[PDB]
Amino acid sequence: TAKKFKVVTTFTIIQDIAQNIAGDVAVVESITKPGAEIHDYQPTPRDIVKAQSADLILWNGMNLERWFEKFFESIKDVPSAVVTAGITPLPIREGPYSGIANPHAWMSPSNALIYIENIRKALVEHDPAHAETYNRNAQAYAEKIKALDAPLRERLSRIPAEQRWLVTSEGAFSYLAKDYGFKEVYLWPINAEQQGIPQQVRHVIDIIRENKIPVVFSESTISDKPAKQVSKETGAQYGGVLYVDSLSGEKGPVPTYISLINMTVDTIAKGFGQ
Ligand SMILES: [Zn+2]
Ligand SMILES: [Zn+2]
Ligand SMILES: [Zn+2]
Ligand SMILES: [Zn+2]
């Protein structure tokens, strides 16, 4: 074992999935730091350095990293791979990004199995000397992700189907909502310029009051103020912060992709009183 294969990912969810597949033979680092907003992130010369020293770059695609393609033009002779190939997208429903793919496909554990397969293929293609390790690690990690679905599904199934309204800030949960049968309500369809303007707040407030929805959420990379304003204006409790666009730090409460899915499902379930 000389120098380990170096993988750089755009953001932290992919970093942790890829690091599980890489195991001991590669080192995976994320360009964005935990807690940073990933859609409109502004890369720096230090990010260029990190990507250029990599052997493989991984990104989400599906319109997530608005910065990536321009950034990647600065990078020479480093292969890249988009990790969402083969996932059927859900379109964004409204706003200036309506009709394009919603990027947050990783919030469906079933989709995460496709993330794993695509990351496996890219590692095997660009570091074939370690193909057997990547293949073994990908199989073991996919087993964990597959087994994750049944307990999560059962817990959210405790919420009566007609009461399954997931009210969040960014509409980042469309894939989880599809999987587990939630109707989706959000303050803005995708992170961009307008996040919590009036008309956005008004629409959500009216939906909450009409259907007596009991809880509203924010997310870990954006402001909690619009959600808290909505809960103050309505009967709904502020259910806290869901994790979707970033892990916590390694020593924080959401250090891994598995911990992110578990934590988000648990916080939703608690907001509905289990
Ligand atoms: Zn493109
Ligand atoms: Zn095996
Ligand atoms: Zn008021
Ligand atoms: Zn997002």
From Swiss-Prot:
One of its GO terms (molecular function) is metal ion binding. Keywords: Ion transport, Iron, Iron transport, Metal-binding, Periplasm, Signal, Transport. One of its GO terms (cellular component) is periplasmic space. SUPFAM superfamilies: Helical backbone' metal receptor. One of its GO terms (biological process) is cell adhesion. CDD domains: PsaA. Pfam families: ZnuA. The keyword Metal-binding applies. It comes from the Bacteria. The keyword Ion transport applies. It is found in: Periplasm. Fe(2+) binds at H39, H104, E170, D245. Belongs to the bacterial solute-binding protein 9 family. There is a second metal binding site (site 2) involving Glu-125 and His-126 which can bind Mn(2+) or Zn(2+). It is unclear what its physiological function is but may participate in protein-protein interactions with other metal- binding proteins. Part of the ATP-binding cassette (ABC) transport system YfeABC involved in iron import. Binds iron with high affinity and specificity and delivers it to the membrane permease for translocation into the cytoplasm. Also binds Mn(2+) and Zn(2+). Monomer. This is Iron-binding protein YfeA. The lineage of its organism: Bacteria, Pseudomonadati, Pseudomonadota, Gammaproteobacteria, Enterobacterales. The gene is yfeA.
